[PDB]
Design a protein around this ligand. Structure first.
Ligand SMILES: [Cl-]
Ligand SMILES: [Cl-]
Ligand SMILES: [Mn+2]
Ligand SMILES: [Mn+2]
Lengths: 22, 29, 29, 22, 29, 22, 29, 29, 29, 22, 22, 22
């Protein structure tokens, strides 16, 4: 519950970021 | 505040890199 | 608007600016 | 009508890049 | 604070897109 | 009264942004 | 400085960094 | 990951995203 | 807060410009 | 002496991109 | 094995760009 | 004592920034 909340506060690694790909 | 419009510019550049040929849906929502 | 070829991360960032609060899909294949 | 072929290989007008908005 | 030097980097990328062949004057002032 | 003030706090759409073009 | 062709949004961002508080004009036609 | 030629400031930003807290070296000559 | 992960994206683009052929080591540390 | 022709088509030195500062 | 020749002139996989991390 | 501290709070000019080059 969701990208703007999770990746804008703490850094999101590339591994966290793949969860938002198709 | 956290500015989500300036952060969203970085994240879409980051998703572009990370997804590649897969692609992604983005919604500031 | 700019009248150019928009490729790679540039086309992403354009989509970001243009679509705004509605958001967008990027599926390049 | 593929976005790369449309806007990266060819040139897209503003109306044609809105097609790809949600 | 709002950081206007980091925001100004985004806005000039945004004006580049939006003005195109017209161009623009920018002043952080 | 002017771009840095108006577009850095609230989002500025492309329509607001054309006002700063030549 | 970098010794390269600077085009599109790259040349904008360079102007931004170089000119600083004085600001710049971009008229590409 | 994206399967493309990454040049100039793009390759920098990729390094930034990929290497993360460890950091990176960019020596292009 | 100051967000150093979003700022670091700008600085590495800025070092890329300013160092050129010299290059640079970056560490968010 | 046009900035595209100068710095995008050719290569500009740092001094030559300062010409375009305010 | 030079990073420009590797990732800008050729195409680099993710593993090959990690070689250049600290 | 060091780049993230000095260039993220106050603006850093290009002259300050060359100190971090090789
Ligand atoms: Cl930012
Ligand atoms: Cl490019
Ligand atoms: Mn930013
Ligand atoms: Mn580019």
């Amino acid at each position: 519950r969701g990208i703007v909340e999770q990746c804008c506060t703490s850094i999101c690694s590339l591994y966290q970021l793949e969860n938002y790909c198709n | 505040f956290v500015n989500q419009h300036l952060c969203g510019s970085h994240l879409v550049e980051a998703l572009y890199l990370v997804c590649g040929e897969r692609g992604f849906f983005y919604t500031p929502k």
